[PDB]
Design an enzyme around this catalytic site. Structure first.
Site, PDB file in Angstrom:
ATOM      1  N   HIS A   1       2.823   7.463   5.857  1.00  0.00           N
ATOM      2  CA  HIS A   1       3.106   6.191   6.024  1.00  0.00           C
ATOM      3  C   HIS A   1       2.735   5.186   4.902  1.00  0.00           C
ATOM      4  O   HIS A   1       1.790   5.685   4.055  1.00  0.00           O
ATOM      5  CB  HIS A   1       2.732   5.485   7.467  1.00  0.00           C
ATOM      6  CG  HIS A   1       1.155   5.963   7.639  1.00  0.00           C
ATOM      7  ND1 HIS A   1       0.530   6.969   7.946  1.00  0.00           N
ATOM      8  CD2 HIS A   1       0.121   4.877   8.014  1.00  0.00           C
ATOM      9  CE1 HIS A   1      -0.787   7.104   8.061  1.00  0.00           C
ATOM     10  NE2 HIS A   1      -0.847   5.456   8.149  1.00  0.00           N
TER      11      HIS A   1
ATOM     12  N   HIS B   1       0.223   7.440   2.412  1.00  0.00           N
ATOM     13  CA  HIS B   1      -1.010   7.996   2.514  1.00  0.00           C
ATOM     14  C   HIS B   1      -0.622   8.699   3.904  1.00  0.00           C
ATOM     15  O   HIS B   1      -0.121   8.436   4.719  1.00  0.00           O
ATOM     16  CB  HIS B   1      -1.862   7.278   2.242  1.00  0.00           C
ATOM     17  CG  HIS B   1      -1.972   6.282   3.566  1.00  0.00           C
ATOM     18  ND1 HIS B   1      -1.435   5.151   3.552  1.00  0.00           N
ATOM     19  CD2 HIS B   1      -2.822   6.375   4.584  1.00  0.00           C
ATOM     20  CE1 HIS B   1      -1.762   4.541   4.627  1.00  0.00           C
ATOM     21  NE2 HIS B   1      -2.469   5.117   5.382  1.00  0.00           N
TER      22      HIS B   1
ATOM     23  N   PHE C   1       0.851  -1.026  -0.048  1.00  0.00           N
ATOM     24  CA  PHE C   1      -0.057   0.012   0.158  1.00  0.00           C
ATOM     25  C   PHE C   1       0.935   1.250  -0.020  1.00  0.00           C
ATOM     26  O   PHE C   1       1.910   1.315   0.817  1.00  0.00           O
ATOM     27  CB  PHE C   1      -0.990  -0.016   1.110  1.00  0.00           C
ATOM     28  CG  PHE C   1      -1.971   1.007   1.077  1.00  0.00           C
ATOM     29  CD1 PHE C   1      -3.191   0.785   0.294  1.00  0.00           C
ATOM     30  CD2 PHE C   1      -2.297   2.417   1.849  1.00  0.00           C
ATOM     31  CE1 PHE C   1      -4.225   1.817   0.371  1.00  0.00           C
ATOM     32  CE2 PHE C   1      -3.198   2.986   1.861  1.00  0.00           C
ATOM     33  CZ  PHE C   1      -4.314   2.942   1.014  1.00  0.00           C
TER      34      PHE C   1
ATOM     35  N   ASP D   1      -3.608   9.438   6.825  1.00  0.00           N
ATOM     36  CA  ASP D   1      -4.809   9.143   7.315  1.00  0.00           C
ATOM     37  C   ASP D   1      -5.824  10.043   7.369  1.00  0.00           C
ATOM     38  O   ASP D   1      -5.888  10.849   7.729  1.00  0.00           O
ATOM     39  CB  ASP D   1      -4.749   8.455   8.766  1.00  0.00           C
ATOM     40  CG  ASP D   1      -4.258   7.107   8.912  1.00  0.00           C
ATOM     41  OD1 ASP D   1      -4.187   6.199   7.891  1.00  0.00           O
ATOM     42  OD2 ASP D   1      -3.733   6.506  10.048  1.00  0.00           O
TER      43      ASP D   1
HETATM   44  C1  LIG Z   1      -2.133   1.512   6.883  1.00  0.00           C
HETATM   45  C2  LIG Z   1      -3.643   1.160   7.225  1.00  0.00           C
HETATM   46  C3  LIG Z   1      -3.717   0.736   8.708  1.00  0.00           C
HETATM   47  S1  LIG Z   1      -4.650   2.719   6.808  1.00  0.00           S
HETATM   48  C4  LIG Z   1      -4.557   2.115   5.174  1.00  0.00           C
HETATM   49  C5  LIG Z   1      -5.897   2.384   4.480  1.00  0.00           C
HETATM   50  N1  LIG Z   1      -7.128   3.207   4.757  1.00  0.00           N
HETATM   51  C6  LIG Z   1      -8.146   3.028   4.326  1.00  0.00           C
HETATM   52  O1  LIG Z   1      -8.280   2.298   3.308  1.00  0.00           O
HETATM   53  C7  LIG Z   1      -9.236   3.808   4.864  1.00  0.00           C
HETATM   54  C8  LIG Z   1     -10.635   3.069   5.227  1.00  0.00           C
HETATM   55  C9  LIG Z   1     -11.862   3.875   5.576  1.00  0.00           C
HETATM   56  C10 LIG Z   1     -13.113   2.926   5.899  1.00  0.00           C
HETATM   57  N2  LIG Z   1     -13.442   2.280   4.584  1.00  0.00           N
HETATM   58  C11 LIG Z   1     -14.209   4.040   6.226  1.00  0.00           C
HETATM   59  O2  LIG Z   1     -15.140   4.172   5.448  1.00  0.00           O
HETATM   60  O3  LIG Z   1     -13.970   4.579   7.440  1.00  0.00           O
HETATM   61  C12 LIG Z   1      -5.969   0.624   4.384  1.00  0.00           C
HETATM   62  O4  LIG Z   1      -6.864  -0.249   4.478  1.00  0.00           O
HETATM   63  N3  LIG Z   1      -4.695   0.794   5.194  1.00  0.00           N
HETATM   64  C13 LIG Z   1      -4.102   0.271   6.128  1.00  0.00           C
HETATM   65  C14 LIG Z   1      -3.230  -0.911   5.930  1.00  0.00           C
HETATM   66  O5  LIG Z   1      -3.124  -1.410   4.757  1.00  0.00           O
HETATM   67  O6  LIG Z   1      -2.820  -1.764   7.109  1.00  0.00           O
HETATM   68 FE   LIG Z   2      -2.885   4.578   7.319  1.00  0.00          FE
END
Ligand SMILES: CC1(C)S[C@@H]2[C@H](NC(=O)CCC[C@H](N)C(=O)O)C(=O)N2[C@H]1C(=O)O
Ligand SMILES: [Fe+3]
Length: 328
Positions: A267, A211, A208, A213
């Protein structure tokens, strides 16, 4: 690649009435928020082993049929009301990650925001109780357990910024919070498909990309597999894993209202071929919540930044993250 300083902070005083001890926690939050932006909350009172066990049981027993039935509209055109809550499917050969997101259990057909069809509010969807005994009960109770932790952390953040302890938490309410839980499965795959691996500018293999948060703060449980990295001026630094604590960081709403005094750390997620869990709680306020921005660096505290309604910030933010980082 160096290692990020991520201090362990005993947050238990934030649940109590020793105000000086609360201030000492607040100082630690301030220091971490001004350094890398991350800390581990310890002595948090949540049974994170049960959380990981119940989440594993769900991830490993839900069937392809049940995933379509719960899928968000990005995967199932029949479910146009599901933008946020529901199942986010993997795509074997292309997309490794899969997840289940749920919102405020108090969002029911009776809730006026559901009646009004206000964006970002949805009624949670759940699997069959008989096929997944106890799952919904666990998941809803977990929402409120981590809500309680998050309320206390917000007291620490308020004190850290020189405010009264309810400065943020007064906007964080069970009847309207837009906070979400996401239960993310990162699988072990053999062979792991290269199509599911992005390559960063610096050569690092990622799951990923970078980004910030979309949150006020983020309260994250992860299983014991190192993967996270925080950007610093000297490059990305590894965040060490700790499957007994919660990883805390500020989101872009906090950066906005503090005039970037508490930045939202950038991150990213390294690619690791290992079965693991990432279980964030995104601390979101109510749809109409507005916090007046300030600047703790100025004597008068005055900031030129415009007050921003949380609901409009959240709607914009979630769309933006999909566009840049891709549909999860
Ligand atoms: C780095 C993170 C902890 S944060 C990042 C990424 N974040 C998102 O997609 C946001 C989700 C919002 C949720 N559907 C809502 O409607 O509130 C994800 O998943 N990622 C995680 C990951 O891949 O671990
Ligand atoms: Fe995140």
């Amino acid at each position: 690649v160096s290692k990020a300083n991520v201090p362990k902070i005993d947050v238990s005083p934030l649940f109590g009435d020793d105000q000086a001890a609360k201030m000492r926690v607040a100082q630690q939050i301030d220091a971490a928020s001004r350094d890398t932006g991350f800390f581990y909350a310890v002595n948090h009172g949540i049974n994170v082993q049960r959380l990981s066990q119940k989440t594993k049981e769900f991830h490993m027993s839900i069937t392809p049929e049940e995933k379509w039935d719960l899928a968000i509209r990005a995967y199932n055109k029949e479910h146009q009301d599901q933008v946020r809550a529901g199942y986010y499917l993997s795509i074997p050969g292309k997309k490794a990650v899969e997840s289940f997101c749920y919102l405020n259990p108090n969002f029911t057909p009776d809730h006026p925001r559901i009646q009004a069809k206000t964006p970002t509010h949805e009624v949670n969807v759940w699997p069959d109780e008989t096929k997944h005994p106890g799952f919904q009960d666990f998941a809803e109770q977990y929402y409120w357990d981590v809500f309680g932790l998050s309320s206390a952390l917000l007291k620490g953040y308020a004190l850290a910024l020189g405010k009264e302890e309810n400065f943020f938490a007064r906007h964080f309410k069970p009847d309207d919070t837009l906070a979400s839980v996401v239960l993310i499965r990162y699988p072990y795959l053999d062979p792991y498909p290269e199509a599911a691996i992005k390559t960063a500018a610096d050569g690092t293999k990622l799951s990923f990309e970078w980004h910030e948060d979309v949150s006020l703060i983020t309260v994250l449980y992860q299983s014991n597999v190192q993967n996270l990295q925080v950007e610093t001026a000297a490059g990305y630094q590894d965040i060490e894993a700790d499957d007994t604590g919660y990883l805390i960081n500020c989101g872009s709403y906090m950066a906005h209202l503090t005039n970037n005094y508490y930045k939202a750390p950038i991150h990213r997620v390294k690619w690791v071929n290992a079965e693991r869990q990432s279980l964030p709680f995104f601390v979101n306020l109510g749809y109409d919540s507005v916090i007046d921005p300030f600047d703790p660096r100025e004597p008068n505290g005055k900031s030129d930044r415009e007050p921003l309604s949380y609901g409009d910030y959240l709607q914009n933010g979630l769309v933006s993250l999909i566009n840049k980082n891709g549909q999860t």
